[PDB]
């Protein structure tokens, strides 16, 4: 069974492990441990025992930015990424958020296709935004409009 919950203090070491396993160029520890607290709606997905994924989001006004999503390699391509993303979107809609934003490596064909299938669109491109093992990569800036529902 899969259980999406808030990501709290106690959860951060497990997530930090996931951060370092799923990203070729992870955040720094300080940056990672610093993206919590006020205005963060941070979520984890638990599969049975293990934490399998996490997502870091910040809400300002009626827009949000997904700073980070990560499914641990052991748990990938099993639909948990989408599921977590879907829970987040529902949660942002109840919160009056109308636009979710994110950045993605231009060559992440996986992530892009996931986002596209969830309704994200390319807004703009930032050239050479990401480092690579041999230079830089473009960032695609993508916006998902979230329709307002009856409550």
């Amino acid at each position: 069974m899969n259980t999406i919950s808030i990501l709290s203090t106690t959860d951060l070491p497990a997530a930090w492990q996931i951060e370092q396993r799923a990203h070729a160029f992870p955040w720094s520890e300080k940056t990672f441990f610093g993206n919590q607290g006020e205005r963060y709606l941070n979520l984890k997905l638990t599969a049975d025992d293990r934490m399998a994924a996490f997502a870091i989001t910040q809400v300002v006004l009626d827009e949000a930015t997904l700073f980070n999503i990560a499914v641990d390699p052991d748990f990938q391509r099993r639909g948990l990424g989408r599921m977590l993303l879907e829970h987040l979107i529902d949660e942002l809609e109840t919160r009056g958020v109308v636009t979710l934003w994110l950045e993605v490596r231009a060559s992440n064909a996986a992530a892009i296709a996931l986002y596209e299938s969830l309704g994200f669109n390319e807004a703009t491109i930032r050239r050479n935004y990401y480092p690579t093992a041999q230079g830089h990569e473009d960032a695609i800036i993508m916006a998902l409009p979230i329709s307002m529902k009856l409550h």
């Binding site: 720094s28 700073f67 990401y130 480092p131």
Partner: peptide
């Protein structure tokens, strides 16, 4: 993933 200089 957002990229930070931090």
């Amino acid at each position: 993933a957002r990229y930070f200089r931090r």
